[PDB]
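Title: [Solved] Myoglobin 3D structure

Original question kept below for reference.
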Amino acid sequence: MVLSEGEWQLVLHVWAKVEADVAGHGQDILIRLFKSHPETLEKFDRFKHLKTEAEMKASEDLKKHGVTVLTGLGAILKKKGHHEAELKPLAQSHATKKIPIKYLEFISEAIIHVLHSRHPGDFGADAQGAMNKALELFRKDIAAKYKELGYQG
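Solution (posted by the thread starter after getting help):
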């Protein structure tokens, strides 16, 4: 997977928008994930109690974790592919405690959806294409990392 500098700059420009309201973006993305893929919730000790969108919107666990997720992702995205240092930790943590790699595809779908919903005037075909490539590179590299530890993701 390879992005041009132009494409990286598209990713980074929209990420700057994310960072203007990290918690709100995180809630929207996690809610989208859990509604798209309610099957993911059961694998989550801390979220499994949430049923309605009302409950999800009100959840401090969900809000706090949406911040964690997007903060970790933004750090990686800012490396523009040179993210081995920022990714290995995130990998061995998810590997040792058993999130299948496929959940990353679901998460990536949610992120794209929410960025388009929230920023339609700038997040067009090019920026969506760029973000898709960036998140695909991320997934591929996580999967390469898992393979080394024996996972099984």
